[PDB]
Amino acid sequence: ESLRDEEAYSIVRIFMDVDLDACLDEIDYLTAIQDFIIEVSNCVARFAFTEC
């Protein structure tokens, strides 16, 4: 998937790509994703507040 026009339909959603070359069990995966969500949402919100 790509963008057909960068001049009018530049509007997109917030997205990220993660790839870790290791295997995690269920509990570690769940705690990791909770912490990841909190940290990333806080960082993006702070950037939006201070620049946008």
């Binding site: 269920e26 509990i27 769940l30 705690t31 909770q34």
Partner: protein, 105 residues
């Protein structure tokens, strides 16, 4: 029922009159589980973990912080509207801006 060696072994069964504070469900399928790892007790659900969330409780030490918490739990130091600290020493509430009394307490 939990003691120093079974805390990571026996499931925990609760009475689900009220919804779980972690999963927002009336009654869970299976009893929750505890785990110990690098100085933190982690509580989660058994069966389908994605049904519920995971909670972390940290326990690290800091004798001095524990002492401060224990002293604070006796309600012997209070902070007033004006911002001065009052301490309970020798059957009296004492405050003194120039001479701090928290160390005396």
């Amino acid at each position: 029922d939990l003691d120093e060696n079974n805390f990571t072994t026996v499931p925990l069964v609760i009475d689900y009159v009220t919804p779980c504070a972690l999963c927002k469900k009336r009654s869970h399928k299976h009893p929750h589980q505890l785990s110990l790892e690098n100085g933190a007790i982690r509580i989660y659900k058994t069966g389908n973990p994605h049904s519920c969330k995971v909670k972390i409780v940290p326990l690290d030490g800091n004798k001095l912080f524990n002492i401060a918490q224990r002293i604070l739990d006796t309600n012997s130091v209070l902070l007033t509207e004006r911002g001065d600290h009052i301490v309970w020493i020798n059957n009296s509430w004492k405050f003194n801006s120039e001479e701090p009394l928290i160390t005396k307490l």
